Amino acid sequence: MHIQMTGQGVDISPALRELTEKKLHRIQPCRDEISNIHIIFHINKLKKIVDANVKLPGSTINAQAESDDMYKTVDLLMHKLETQLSKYKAK
Numbered sequence: 785m786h787i788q789m790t791g792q793g794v795d796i797s798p799a800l801r802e803l804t805e806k807k808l809h810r811i812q813p814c815r816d817e818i819s820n821i822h823i824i825f826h827i828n829k830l831k832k833i834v835d836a837n838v839k840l841p842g843s844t845i846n847a848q849a850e851s852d853d854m855y856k857t858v859d860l861l862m863h864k865l866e867t868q869l870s871k872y873k874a875k
């Protein structure tokens with residue numbers, strides 16, 4: 785799996801980078817069918833938004849989540865991804 789991370793107006797800390805990596809490597813179902821994941825971190829005032837673009841064979845998943853804490857946001861985005869992956873699998 786190929787993971788690209790971009791901080792838009794924000795510097796992705798090493799810890800946040802590692803945390804996001806290991807959680808993506810845990811995601812399911814159909815994780816091994818994923819070719820590319822591009823993650824974009826950004827903040828809008830107090831909002832810690834994390835956005836993700838995931839490429840599977842034949843389709844693409846776009847998911848976004850936000851909170852007051854970037855680490856918490858990542859966690860939220862994973863649940864949205866898993867949901868979207870489960871729909872993908874169900875099709």
